[PDB]
Ligand binder design. Sequence first.
Ligand SMILES: Nc1ncnc2c1ncn2[C@@H]1O[C@H](COP(=O)(O)OP(=O)(O)O)[C@@H](O)[C@H]1O
Ligand SMILES: Nc1ncnc2c1ncn2[C@@H]1O[C@H](COP(=O)(O)OP(=O)(O)O)[C@@H](O)[C@H]1O
Ligand SMILES: [Mg+2]
Ligand SMILES: [Mg+2]
Ligand SMILES: [Mg+2]
Ligand SMILES: [Mg+2]
Lengths: 486, 486
Amino acid sequence: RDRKYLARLKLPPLSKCEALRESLDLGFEGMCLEQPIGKRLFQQFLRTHEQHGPALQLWKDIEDYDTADDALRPQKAQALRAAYLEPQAQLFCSFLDAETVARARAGAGDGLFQPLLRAVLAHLGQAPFQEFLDSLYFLRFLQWKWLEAQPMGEDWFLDFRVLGRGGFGEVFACQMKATGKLYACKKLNKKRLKKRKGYQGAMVEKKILAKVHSRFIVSLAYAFETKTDLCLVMTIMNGGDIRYHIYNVDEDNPGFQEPRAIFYTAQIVSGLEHLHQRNIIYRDLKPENVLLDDDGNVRISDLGLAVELKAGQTKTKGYAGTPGFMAPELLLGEEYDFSVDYFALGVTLYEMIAARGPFRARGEKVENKELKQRVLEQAVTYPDKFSPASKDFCEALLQKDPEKRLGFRDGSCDGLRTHPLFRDISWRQLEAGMLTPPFVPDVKGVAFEKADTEFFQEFASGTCPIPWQEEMIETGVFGDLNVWRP
Amino acid sequence: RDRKYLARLKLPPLSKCEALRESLDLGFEGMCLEQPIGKRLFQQFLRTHEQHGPALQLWKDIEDYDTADDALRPQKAQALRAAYLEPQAQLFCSFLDAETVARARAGAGDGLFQPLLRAVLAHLGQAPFQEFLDSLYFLRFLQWKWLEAQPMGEDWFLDFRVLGRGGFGEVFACQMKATGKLYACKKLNKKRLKKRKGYQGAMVEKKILAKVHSRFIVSLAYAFETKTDLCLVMTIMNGGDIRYHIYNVDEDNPGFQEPRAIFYTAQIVSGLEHLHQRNIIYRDLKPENVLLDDDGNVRISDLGLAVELKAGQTKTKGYAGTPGFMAPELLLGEEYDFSVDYFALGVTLYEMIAARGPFRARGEKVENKELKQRVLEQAVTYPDKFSPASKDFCEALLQKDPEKRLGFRDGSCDGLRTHPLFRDISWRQLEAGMLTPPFVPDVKGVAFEKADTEFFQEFASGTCPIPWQEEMIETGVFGDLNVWRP
Ligand SMILES: Nc1ncnc2c1ncn2[C@@H]1O[C@H](COP(=O)(O)OP(=O)(O)O)[C@@H](O)[C@H]1O
Ligand SMILES: Nc1ncnc2c1ncn2[C@@H]1O[C@H](COP(=O)(O)OP(=O)(O)O)[C@@H](O)[C@H]1O
Ligand SMILES: [Mg+2]
Ligand SMILES: [Mg+2]
Ligand SMILES: [Mg+2]
Ligand SMILES: [Mg+2]
């Protein structure tokens, strides 16, 4: 971990933060719930003001309950009602209207104290937040926000191994010099990008990865440019992709035992739900695009083919994707939904179990025209490796007509999580990354004009707030720079 | 210690401090050296900024040297030159011009690193201070300054014993309810004060005690008013006055053994020097006005007869004082100096040793006219209880002609500290209250008009900055209210 760079992270004089005190969203949930550092500084304020003690403690306890092993839930719920909900107890929460306290008292299932937590946060967003804004803790948040906006480009990162190769350049495992955090840096050589008309794709990816924060999508931390390249510094995923893992590990016995395959399906499904909730269509889901991190958790990646539906827009058109994964509606030149992605999910689960595609034989290579016809009118065949459940799930995803295809209804995939295939999957624990993964790894003549440079600048948009604050915190740097009296 | 009142000490929202951010002196030495809390907060800033580390540590070390037992001085000076003055050492102070470093390197006596310290503080007053002002630490100082200005009057103090009786009311030992700190509250019934024309005297005292900060003058902490009284909350002195101690403890063998008497004289002399340095003439020094605290240290008190010389004024006129202590020049109706006080010092040391006055016999009571003549023309007589030194000192203070009287020359009493009488007195340790004391204890028809109410308001000027910050600190309240992360 480089000391010269560590030393460039130093909180500024308050006078330097006056400007970005206007260019900043004051919004409560925006800054105190979503930004890791704001949340940390706002909980600190709370901890040092008696009045708010109970609310802070309840809040903290709820998140503790939401992350507890199922075994400990009953008692944590017990102590929680005892500690904040009996009008006796010291930490009773008088700001909770009795109707809310009643419900919280009578415990349902998963989502038990969710409506409690919403009431607590609704409370904190009023005076407590308004007080925070009038406290030193808020001024500290502005200092941090200032350091976050400072330039941290190429000289800040040390490449030290190739993770893979891609259309426009290599992908390196690299270190952020100050903090020593490990990332993946994806390079896109500038000249090739122009030569091959790939600006739209490159940008769609950067914007998606920046504005999306899921443990199942790879996450963008930084975006800058060099003499030669555009760069995307993002979550490092060191455990190879699903497709590698299907064919290349167990060579003579290709495939996944159902449970493992289901685990991934479940994680991937969570990846889609997030994209679709933000009106994004992936358009490119497949084994080769799904990566494993060191622990054996999985994230979707590679998003050059994605599209963002403009607000109010529900359907779109356009040929795009990988042959053998594009769904019927797309091929028929029709306008399509998120449904497209679910068809791809199905092809994917299928491949994970059968170590082969549904639409061709091993080595069988056909013309596009023919592959198209198979996808459109060929009924899929399910060998014995499949279990009733698997088979049925794949049938529901691979439904030729999107109107009849298992997918995304009512702003979620809840309908889908229901399926008998996910019988042994605790969605709570999965969504929170707290389940044990079933498997743990071990050119000539281009001239740059005005429009080219503009594009580059718009691409190199600098640091991504949430992931940077995460890094500062995980890496210890926040604790160190934040001390008041040593 | 009262919890209801403790709870009224809570730092305010920054917005409430905007106003007193103009009505405040920014001055460096004024806020960071003289105000205990500003100093504490400014050292905190310093501790949390690497660059300033060396300067802060030097500063701290010097005060440590200035308070060390004489036994430890040599080595502390050693480690000090080793740690900040050799260009090698980590904590070397590059901001010290070499000429200063040279002098500091070659050690004299008492006052060794004084000119070093002045250079360190001169440094801190520049950028470091200017940075402080742009830091959160300065904003915290504004919060504290806000709490300090909040109303803390009679309901904030619990009387619980009479310490003594005075012309206009009693003096009580009382507790500051919030902090539990013990004070003396001196009451002046409002009606009597008016009836007997005592407003000037009462005020002269309050202003003197407020604007003066010495360990040898009693110290004013608060000044407020009740329905019936004006109030002065001040240092508590529980060990009786010198005059009580002269006659009333050892009844049949009245007096002080020289060393004890010298100790007091030395303390008292320090009391005068402060008063004179601020152009104040005491006019009322005497055994009955000199108090003992619990440890047996001594402070001068009772200041209704004092006068403050307007700036540029060097001499004054006016009959005032206690018969038997007023000096010749004063009696002769002439205009007088601080010299007056030194004559009183002399009568005082004399009484401490002889258990009698120099000018009359036991029980001898004469007319003013006669007592005057004795003071003016009677030569003093020194029994055997006196040592050459004592006798000589008293002769020098009791000199009828102020032009020839030992006293206050060149802005100090250094000339006087020189005397052979103080041969065994370490002035350094005395001035710092770190010596072991030789003895350790165990009405009708008055109507209030406009002018009366105005006077009262001007008198009840509230809390005294320095002593309040001291209290907050000693009493632990500052530590508690100042925490950043618990
Ligand atoms: N976040 C990452 N962590 C580790 N390796 C990666 C990461 N992203 C990509 N790679 C490696 O780089 C390859 C190409 O990256 P990708 O973004 O898929 O390029 P393209 O979009 O040009 O196909 C991947 O197959 C993978 O092996
Ligand atoms: N700070 C104090 N601590 C303890 N006792 C005190 C203090 N101030 C006054 N007293 C007691 O109360 C008496 C009267 O106080 P004083 O200020 O001398 O009033 P006055 O000016 O009317 O003489 C003193 O003689 C002393 O015994
Ligand atoms: Mg790829
Ligand atoms: Mg791509
Ligand atoms: Mg008195
Ligand atoms: Mg008086």
